[PDB]
Amino acid sequence: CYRKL
Amino acid sequence: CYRKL
Amino acid sequence: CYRKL
Amino acid sequence: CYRKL
Amino acid sequence: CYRKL
Amino acid sequence: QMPSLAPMLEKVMPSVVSINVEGSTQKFMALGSGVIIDADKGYVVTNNHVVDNATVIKVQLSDGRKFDAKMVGKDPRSDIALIQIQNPKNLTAIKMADSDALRVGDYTVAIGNPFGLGETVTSGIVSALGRSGLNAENYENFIQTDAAINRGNAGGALVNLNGELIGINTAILAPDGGNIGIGFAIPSNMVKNLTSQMVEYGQVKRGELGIMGTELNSELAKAMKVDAQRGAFVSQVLPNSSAAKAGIKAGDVITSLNGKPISSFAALRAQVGTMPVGSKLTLGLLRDGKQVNVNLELQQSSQSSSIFNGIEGAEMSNKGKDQGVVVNNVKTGTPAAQIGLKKGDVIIGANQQAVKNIAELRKVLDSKPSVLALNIQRGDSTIYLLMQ
Amino acid sequence: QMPSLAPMLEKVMPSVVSINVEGSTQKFMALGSGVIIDADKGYVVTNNHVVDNATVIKVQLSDGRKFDAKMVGKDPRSDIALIQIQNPKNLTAIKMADSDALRVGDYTVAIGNPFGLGETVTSGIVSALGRSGLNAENYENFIQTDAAINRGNAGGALVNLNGELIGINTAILAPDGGNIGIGFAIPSNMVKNLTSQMVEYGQVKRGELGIMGTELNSELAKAMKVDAQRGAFVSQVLPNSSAAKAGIKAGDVITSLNGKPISSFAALRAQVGTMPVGSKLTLGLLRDGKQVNVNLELQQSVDSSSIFNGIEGAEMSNKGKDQGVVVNNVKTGTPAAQIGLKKGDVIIGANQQAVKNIAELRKVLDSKPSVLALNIQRGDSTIYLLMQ
Amino acid sequence: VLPNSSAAKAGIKAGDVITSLNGKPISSFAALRAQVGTMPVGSKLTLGLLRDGKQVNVNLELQQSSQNQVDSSSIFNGIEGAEMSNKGKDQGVVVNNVKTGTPAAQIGLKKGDVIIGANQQAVKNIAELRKVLDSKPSVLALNIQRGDSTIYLLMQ
């Protein structure tokens, strides 16, 4: 699960 | 399952 | 309803 | 439903 | 299981 | 001109009866079926679990005639019971067939009283022979059939197309209490031998050969380098046993009975477990891949419910020479241990009358007094136990 | 003298076997029946729903012999699998008959192993033909029978009075898990076509004619001024398909296949779903009340779950000539869209390994790494996707 | 890396591994997320990469968010669930994200809305919006536009 900074 | 009469 | 064996 | 041959 | 005769 | 089973059935159906019984243990009522064995004497076979703990026995014929019946024998190991009609008047006996010639594929007709509706006829075929495994302690060599059989068919007849009795419908395999096409019946040859013993003695004289064993699967068959993938495997022979006197050793594999192939150990145990003492039979053995035949003769094996007719849980027999009725063993929580009697007790007398054997004792059980006083002795001590 | 079925069974029953299965998924053990198709090669047909995800498979004959068997083919769309006995020694095969000559009213004999009790035979008749609908995606042309069939009968043989294989017992209609007299079997002619592809190729070469359709009811025949009330209604013919190349137009009604009438579209669909690609057959058509016959020749015939096992909902294929795995279309809310896949992506590689097509992809899926890193590209961008 | 992103402009490629921030090693991705989520916009920092077993250092500078900049809460002091940002040059506040089951979507806010005005005052940016919410009006009449249409949404 990639999240935005 | 197994039963009598 | 329908069954297998 | 639409079935295919 | 061993049975007798 | 149409093929039908009605011509045979109008002959045999009167020989099939229904059984109404009332008893208690907490009063209950149940019902089963039965087959006229001796039309003259009034002998009707049924399942022992149909007549277990039974006070009153009423039978209704196919034609609606009512009679009264009394217990004759009972055998919970094989679930075969025999009763006798009081005042037998105008009966029709049934022909018996040789079940050892039965083949899977033969047509079968089941006759009983499912749900007390009356004599109900169903059809089927022999599903299999020698089926067993419902209760490992019973002498079970059941015949499987797709004949519709439900509660009430118990003690009913399984017959062939010529009206000959092949088996007594006994139990079914039903996950829902309703027949799914799997019924089991006790073959005639078994019931033939069992009844004949109950006719003379009221009990079955259990004779044994004195051998131990277990089932032969293909796994163990490979281990002993024996070709047969099924049969009876000889574990050991007891000393002074008929097998020891005949020449049977450990490591043998039983394959046939009187030439008739063996289906399993479980069937073979029930086969001879019902034959009367002294029955001369031949067996086929297989030791070291070499076929051997031996001839044998059964021997005696020397071993409460059968005597009270209502108090179970205590095996008892006679003692020495006119030494009373010693009780062999008692089960915990049964109608016998509920009155105090324990294993080792020796019933010497009752109600001011001495008891040398089981026959002298039942002379008081038939006297049916209001209160009973059992003068047993535990060890060298003198005690009493009271009932009713 | 009595009629009996034992003579046929004594020669045919050795052909029927019982199957014991061990697998894992939550490890499980299952049991059923099988049929020897080729005695020499040891090919044994069974139900595919019996042998799925099975690690250890042992097969026990009618006489009690145990073997180990290995998988040969499987086809869940028709529920037929083929196993091979290891060390086939002294087996008995079954002769298969032409099921397309079967008629409602023929006597049937079922053979199987209900509840692991053993080889159990029951009798019945052909209730109906062409039955389908228990699982609409499956190719089912079931024969209905009142022959008794319970849990474990699966993979068993359905034979006529001569012992020739007519069908493979598959499923029952039991709201309570016990038989009530409705068994379904897949006709032998379908089993004969489905087994023959697993012998040569190990899978089924699914062929297509290239037409859409649905069942013909009595209401539709009135609108189309068609006489026949049952059959296959041609919605359309697909371009460059075998059927289109053959002269089939929309609005036609199919009536026969190889001279044999057709029971239903869902039954006709099951027929060809078993025949190998290119089989030349004859069709009965009906356009404007005139019969037209045509010979045909199947043509050859993608999801993410076809190369995934668990992740569906994204249409994908190869790009150009060794240009990666392009994504055709994705539905928002699928196991592929749950991991971010979008329509138009171009899979370049994964885990530092280049990917030119589905074949180079499937070379690394078999390596089964713990975590996967796809090097796909969306437009001018280069992105990554992770799995497991 | 997103297009027109400082990382893309700095020379950062996908599949790389970050190891340090300003020299201080990074414990995890979630920890770095919290580090930079507090740094003021334009904060100049240095990063340490590991690509094909090669160490890389980069100078970078924080940028604003044209997507999911300002969530609803910090403006209304009680209404969450709507991430929003400015449009064009004083062309309103488009809502980037609306959460399912939150106080913002409970009044009907969807993605794509473009707020032009509210309570007879044209609204061009989040400051002009907050300039009316500090007035704390009893009821709020939003002259937003969804698509080519000009609609209204009410509050309190």
Residue numbers in the entry:
A (entry chain N), D (entry chain P), E (entry chain Q): 471 to 475
B (entry chain K), C (entry chain J): 460 to 464
F (entry chain E): 11 to 35, 82 to 359, 364 to 448
G (entry chain D): 11 to 35, 82 to 357, 362 to 448
H (entry chain B): 293 to 448
Study authors write:
First, DegP is an allosteric protease, whose activity is carefully regulated, and a hyperactive DegP variant kills bacteria. Second, because DegP is an inherently promiscuous protease that degrades misfolded proteins, over-activated DegP may destroy various proteins that mediate essential processes in the bacterial envelope, such as cell wall maintenance, membrane construction, or cell division. DegP mainly degrades misfolded proteins, but its over-activation by the tripodal compounds triggers excessive degradation of newly synthesized proteins and leads to bacterial death.
Interestingly, activation was observed with TMB_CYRKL and TMB_CKYRKL, but not with TMB_CRKL or TMB_CKL. In particular, TMB_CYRKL increased the cleavage rate by at least ten times more than Lpp+Leu and TMB_CKYRKL. Activation was followed by inhibition at higher concentrations of compounds and maximal activation occurred at around 100 µM. The concentration-dependent activation and inhibition suggest that the tripodal compounds also bind to the active site of DegP. Alanine substitution of each residue of the pentapeptide (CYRKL) revealed that tyrosine is most important for activation. Overall DegP structures were almost identical to that of the dodecameric DegP with an active conformation (rmsd 0.697 Å and 0.986 Å, respectively, for 2309 Cα atoms in six DegP subunits). Additional electron density maps were found at positions where two degrons of 18–58 are present in the dodecamer model. Because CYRKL and CYYKI have hydrophobic C-terminal residues that can occupy both the S1 pocket of the active site and the hydrophobic pocket of PDZ1, we believe that these peptides are located in the two substrate-binding sites in the same fashion as two degrons of 18–58. Although the lack of electron density for the central benzene ring hampers determination of the binding mode, we suggest that only one arm of the tripodal compounds in the co-crystal structures binds to either substrate-binding sites of DegP, because the distances between two cysteine-Cα atoms in the CYYKI peptides of the crystal structure are too long to justify any of the three plausible modes for the bi- or tri-partite interactions. Nevertheless, the simultaneous binding of multiple arms in solution cannot be ruled out, because a slight change of peptide conformation may allow the connection of two pentapeptides to the benzylic scaffold without changing the position of the two C-terminal hydrophobic residues. Taken together, the crystal structures suggest that the tripodal compounds mainly bind to the substrate-binding sites of DegP.
